[PDB]
Design a protein around this ligand. Structure first.
Ligand SMILES: [Zn+2]
Ligand SMILES: [Zn+2]
Lengths: 336, 337
């Protein structure tokens, strides 16, 4: 029973590995929720604390720039870098208040967005020097469009620099050669990275479009790797599930059976978060400056109905419940 | 032309006093916008940067708690403390990007809420020892409902702690004793706080309820009262703050500024404006159901392009910043950098 499960706030290094090993041996996945604001991270940290669970918070290139502000010029990645750094501090500062472990991660970063990556690593190293931990728990590379040699080669390059701070790296491989991801292809990724550090996960292509989903393939990766490595471990790899929304409870089950520790959500939550605020369209009669349908026809004050603290909270509550659904479906609810 | 007019990020210490003196000398005031989310601080910073203006961002007790999340128990001021600190780091982290000097302030703290004040002040100090700087630029005490010798008493003790950090204290005095606040009472505050440090500002009851009419002229009375009993030459020995005065005329704002108001608080107006742009996303209500869009096809064509919060939340930002840009024109702070 690793320390991680009793901790509170953002975790790093060995705590991230222990948590992922705990997930594999207790058989649950941890949802990874894309966030774009303090409000949406509040929604996720709440759903997580309430169901006594660990959570992964991620920022995409676009979500990171939202934290910066859409009016901040991002031609140079200046917004995604500032925004992600801004969200990192905010999340670090508030996460302990909810009393769970939080993995802080960045989402998909393709080859043309590598400067977004480079800026985060700089800030990471700088932060690591002053404080003993990086800023982010985890970072993702998605060079699945490149050939696999380039993809694995430059992941190793970054990974070597990431490993100096114990940071976690998530890597994606698709079907680019020089259809699903072959287990051989996935083991090649393991070969190079495990030479550097064991703190890495892999997201493969198994029908999870983002003709359908063959979660049984992830077991084939795990099994192939077993043989090659010559190990007893059921789950020699750490695996991630991309494009998760719409898959049945049974699909998520074999995926988790096959070593998946993390399932990404985003646009499900996106919609969820909207519902609560959308459903406040019952009050459009009370959502003008002073005109109220109710009492005092035009002399009533609508402050109590237009306070964003009132209606944004509706979005938080509705997003949280969607997340809670997941936390149960992924068997993560109650694992602390 | 003080150095602050060319800085980016949360300013501290003398820069704050430097900003206020320029505000008094050039005769503008600075809107303080209450904020509750990253989304809302973005709206304010973007309005400041676009209208080339300094800006004050503040957090009320319930604003801080919101930043922490409404599902967090605040009964020991536990959410307002965490939430104000987490908002402080985010604002500090993002402010430089907008290329603007920012004052990071905290709104009305009464006697019942002073746990919150101690929680914020302990963390300011921990952070000072590590960085040479507190988190917040200034804080407000509002002990106007207590007797004025008790109001000024605790302010002085807290100000003595804050002055080690160059931190700015804002104090509110009302009509109680120990109708409008007199100049005599106001100069009492200045009498006590000026011992500790210059970096403070007064909010007095001059009919700005938050019956009596609003009379900005009294602010001049305070200045000329303090002026005489100091004996100095300068028009404004006091730093003065305008609370709850939205919907006052441009003339009423103009006389308050010329009496040395440097900070006008805005809260509900921005709230309504923020909602405005998101509410106007009525419009796409038919696109606001999971996957079927009444437009192109009822299954086949999807809606994620319209339900993305990065789209519609931004609309609230844009209308909130527009309300803030009017304020910077009305308070003449527009284009002062
Ligand atoms: Zn992917
Ligand atoms: Zn007041």
């Amino acid at each position: 029973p690793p320390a991680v499960l009793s901790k509170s706030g953002v975790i790093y290094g060995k705590d991230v590995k222990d948590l992922f090993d705990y997930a594999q041996e207790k058989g649950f996945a941890i949802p990874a929720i894309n966030v774009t604001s303090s409000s949406t991270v509040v929604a996720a940290l709440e759903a997580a604390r309430d169901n006594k669970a660990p959570i992964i918070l991620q920022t995409s290139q676009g979500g990171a720039a939202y934290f910066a502000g859409k009016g901040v010029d991002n031609k140079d990645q200046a917004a995604s870098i500032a925004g992600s750094i801004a969200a990192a501090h905010y999340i670090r500062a508030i996460a302990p208040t909810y009393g769970i472990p939080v993995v802080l991660h960045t989402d998909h970063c393709a080859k043309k967005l590598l400067p977004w990556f480079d800026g985060m690593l700089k800030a990471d190293e700088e932060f690591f020097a002053k404080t003993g931990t990086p800023l982010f728990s985890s970072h993702m590379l998605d060079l699945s469009e490149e050939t696999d040699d380039e993809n694995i080669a430059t992941c190793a390059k970054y990974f070597e620099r990431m490993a100096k701070m114990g940071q976690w790296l998530e890597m994606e491989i698709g079907i680019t050669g020089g259809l699903y991801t072959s287990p051989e292809t996935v083991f090649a990724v393991y070969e190079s990275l495990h030479k550097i550090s064991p703190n890495f996960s892999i997201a493969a292509a198994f029908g999870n479009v983002h003709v359908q989903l063959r979660p049984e393939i992830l077991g084939d990766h795990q099994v192939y790797a077993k043989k090659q490595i010559g190990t007893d471990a059921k789950h020699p790899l750490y695996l991630v599930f991309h494009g998760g929304s719409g898959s049945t409870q049974e699909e998520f089950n074999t995926a988790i059976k096959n070593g998946v520790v993390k399932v990404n959500l985003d646009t499900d939550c996106q919609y969820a978060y909207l519902t609560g605020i959308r459903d406040y369209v019952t009050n459009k009669i009370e959502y003008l400056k002073a005109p109220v349908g109710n009492p005092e026809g035009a002399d009533k004050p609508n402050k109590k109905y237009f306070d964003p603290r009132v209606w944004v909270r509706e979005g938080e509550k509705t997003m949280s419940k969607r997340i809670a659904e997941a936390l149960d479906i992924f068997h993560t609810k109650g694992q602390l």
